[model samples]
Target chain A: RAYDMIMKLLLVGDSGVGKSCLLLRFVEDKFNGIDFKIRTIESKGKRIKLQVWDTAGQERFRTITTAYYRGAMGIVLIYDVTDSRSFENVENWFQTVTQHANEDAQIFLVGNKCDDEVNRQVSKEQGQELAAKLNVPFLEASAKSNENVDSIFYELASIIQEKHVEENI
Target chain B: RAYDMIMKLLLVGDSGVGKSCLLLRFVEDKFNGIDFKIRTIESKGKRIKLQVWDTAGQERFRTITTAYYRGAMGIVLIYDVTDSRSFENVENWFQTVTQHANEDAQIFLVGNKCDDEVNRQVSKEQGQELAAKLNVPFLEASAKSNENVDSIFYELASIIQEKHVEENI
Candidate 1:
């Protein structure tokens, strides 16, 4: 079963922030510990196998996590709206990706738990500012309410696909 | 940064067979959910980046696990010496490997937790019998005792390295 393309995109952030919930919502997939969930989606007439990797709770193995970044075509930094710690950690996560991940690797930012503003510790504008500072796209997703979750993988796959096509030229 | 070879080996078996424990004893790595720990080892004058993947709790994502197997060059089936249920799952694991892994992928058998014979649910004789039946090398390891844990990776790496060398001829 040869997929048209295999793009390994990574999901990274602090321990909370519902990375597993976000992935489960998008692809109906795994928990923490760096498991990848597969979703074959069509973009530009190509079927891309999006291997979304969830590096939940890997702070202890920073070296191992950094090493695995070499293969990722796209990387998403997910943070929880209720957890300020996860949101702040995105700076460090972004720095690691910039240093280790391939220069062509597409990066995205997501602030999860947008369903409830009453429990929100982070604001949507702050997420946008962080994304602008990081120079990547930004989105607020609610895995609990299923908000903007599908676009996360599909949009990233499209960017990776376009980059993959242009590289041959 | 280019190594002599990049070898991807996978560890598959029932939960609670100490797959992570055995891997930690060898590489000092992660828990369930299919994370990989990198160990660059030298054998026969060639340095190999051995990526040992552990699928700790992925029974629900069989499709993802099977797709990941296409990249693996070595697959190990581990069972608990103290759990009969885990011991019985080797047959299914072997069948999965045979069906999805590379045709030349090397397979190995390990009976973990051999240190406690009083709690043993599967005997060494049975483990040996399964290994022979599957036509793979067999070993009994004790992660607690660090018994034969390191040997498992070394032995499999040597076999994979040799096979890589042979494939060119």
Candidate 2:
């Protein structure tokens, strides 16, 4: 009846930046209805049910999502590569999550919509620099193309899984 | 140079129930970027600037938006008439807003997307009954058809304006 640790991951960012789509690509890969995904992944010789929460990222919803940050095992802060404003707000999102989220909650920086190369506004180097400044891992991904979407979730799951094992040990 | 009063209004419900669309219908009547709107209206001979907050209505964002309730003067809890699930969640949304929002904040129940008669799952009578139970005003509207969208904001503005007058008197 029991397996490994249940990791609660949160996806947050500015609206219309594809936070929902990135989650859609990973969970149902469908456009409508579902807002969450439950993935069973094998990590550190254990099975973990990764419960992912995707916030649609409107300003009004921040208070609601902030309460869950303390319970989350990992947090993915996303931004649209095609929209400079979304990327700019990453710092604000990071600050809010850090202020309210658990001290040990792992944070990841993601530049999404990388598939739109022609309209790209945020470059990989810029994303990396910001991630470095914030002291978090970073990735460039496309929900439409399914590029690096799974990797982001899998990597975070593994990290949390390892931490669970370490704490238990 | 002094206006009558400023009111902060919130539009909240489940995602995909057209809360943003209703705001769109009132502000620009066009579907695009902006999720919230600020408008100045004259109500009961008083000039009022209505600051409307629209929550995209995903679970994670609730923590963030809940904080705004305490400052809100009015709230429009919306649901898609075609989607019964969204209607079902209206009670929960109302409870959250009332629990955290200002004690005297005026709340309104709105059944949105009435333009789609084919998929309608919730009835007008049902919406009215629920509003009656909660002791709040009720209305049916459609962002696509521009049905009662403007009236909802106008009515809420008047209500808040009246409250302001009562308190000041």
Candidate 3:
């Protein structure tokens, strides 16, 4: 009851894109069981409760993974800037999330591991290009150094919260 | 039991230097009671357990504050980038920490709130100059956006851990 709303977010993309570590950095360096319970965060005077789930990367668990996507209000389509394959698979991940998530689910594109940009295979412009193509908001972040980690959730939460407010109104 | 080493780090600066918030971000957006229990982090194959304490900022708790410094192996001397007075007092904080802490305490100088750099009163070069004069490591960080938050603790811990290893040897 401390919060005005409870929002669900999904973490989607390849393994080693740092999905667990990224959530850990955003939460304060910890998350497991492929799920995280975020401490309540306030935005625009309203406290919002947050729930996040990270689906497995392999197809062996693909059917089980789809069950986690239902009712998710937002999805983070992530890739490792250092791993070109992860970046390449984002569109495939995006397709999966959008299919299983709510029709109007908010999508956020992120290039994780930006702290290691010196070894990055996907350029910043390439990330922008993909986000532009997907028509979702984009950013480069580092779970190790904690760059732009909070922004990803807060921005997505804020927008989702605003939309929920309008619907309630 | 899971960690090979335990390190105590102090957070000291003027009030509102974001000592607490900075720790919160480093922790996955959580910390309190002016102290935190960090989950073990692995480096060089050794698990390191991190303990951090934030001392009170006011003179009323001055004596009580110094009590927290004795066993601290590392200290973070922080200042708000937008608050000139906070930046101005780094030398004072630096002196206090060094005087009360162990002789070889590691000091890390930080300019907090760099996410709002547009309004920063203390330039990055200024932060560097102070660190250079004090001969301590330095960086700019943001608790809100979490830039460099993890690096601050990790670098300091790794160094402290190494020093402890040498001492043990």
Candidate 4:
């Protein structure tokens, strides 16, 4: 099994905020899907498997009431730049995921759909400010144009791998 | 071919409001999957194919940016009762769907996550009131416990079938 270690990642955000799109772009290299996407990669000379779970934004897993966040090693909290509410709701999503996700789980705040520059409502600084407040890394990506989409996953993976090494040492 | 008309339906709602769950429960007779679900039903003696498009609340389809809603004959607008923002944003979704969907498109208001009654934030009266205001039928459902999940689709299908009959007559 090329899967030396499996890092489970959960994608969370306000509905219609490109959570699915980002995962599709990163794993399937497309902008669609309603399930988990997996990939194997070599990091730190060790093979690692990435299991990205796209919740499809289902309400059952919306709040922290469900154990859906269990075993998640990383989480990509997403929002839409063109929708202010989606941006605002990022805080709610972050709070819920942190409350339930494992302590070792790394969180990355992402502002998706940056391709709609004309109708963009959430600015890059706003995303950074929120990420700073929450003490998480932030990135603005457009799954449609494939901008920074791969970076979100690889960056999070590297951080997870780095943390694993640090914990072992 | 199960020869019949195809009724394309779109699921739209704030992120994390169970749109996908409802679709999953309706189509797969389960509450999972990250793809489109289809079903054929005998409505008024005619076999009608239901093409339920679960956008996963992707922001790209949130505000009618693409041709995603073009062929949609019906739309299940969803929201989470435990999350008031999801309910409050229903109006915005309605406005956008109406503006872009077919003139004869039927809109159904669905208040999801009703299974979490202990933490429910939006009242049944509230959902009904909003539905009344929008002149659309309303239902409070729970995709997790499979409560009223099928009825949402059945109700919408019946409505669409009725319209088709009316227009033909």
Give the top-scoring candidate (TM-score): 1
Cα shift from native, residue A49, model 4 (Å) = 27
Instruction: Point out where model 4 deviates above 4 Å.
Output: A1-169, B32-35, B61-63, B165-169
Give the Å error, residue B15, model 2.
0.4
User: What C-alpha lDDT values do all the predictions have?
Assistant: 0.75, 0.74, 0.73, 0.75
* Overall local distance difference test of candidate 4: 0.75
Candidate 4 per-residue lDDT over residues A1-169, each given as its tens digit: 3334556678988778887777778877887523455776677676766778776353333233233354467889999999999988877778777776556679999999999999999889999999999999999999999999878878888898776421110
- Off-target runs (Cα >4 Å) in candidate 1 are A29-32, A59-62, A165-169, B1-169
The order by descending DockQ is: 1, 2, 4, 3
Span of ten consecutive residues with least summed lDDT in model 3 chain A: A58-67
Per model, the share of native interface contacts recovered reads 0.00, 0.00, 0.00, 0.00
Best by DockQ: 1
Candidate 2 chain B minimal-lDDT segment of 10 residues? B58-67
Instruction: For model 1, state the Cα shift of residue A103 in Å.
Output: 0.4
Could you tell me the lDDT of residue A22 within candidate 1? 86
CAPRI quality level assigned to candidate 4 from its DockQ score: incorrect
Across residues A80-105, which tens digit of lDDT does each residue of candidate 1 receive? 87888888889888887787666778
Question: How well does candidate 3 match the true structure in TM-score terms?
Answer: 0.47
Q: Which 10-residue window in model 3 chain B sums to the lowest lDDT?
A: B58-67
- In candidate 3, position A65 carries an lDDT of 33
**TM-scores of the models, in the given order?**
0.51, 0.48, 0.47, 0.48
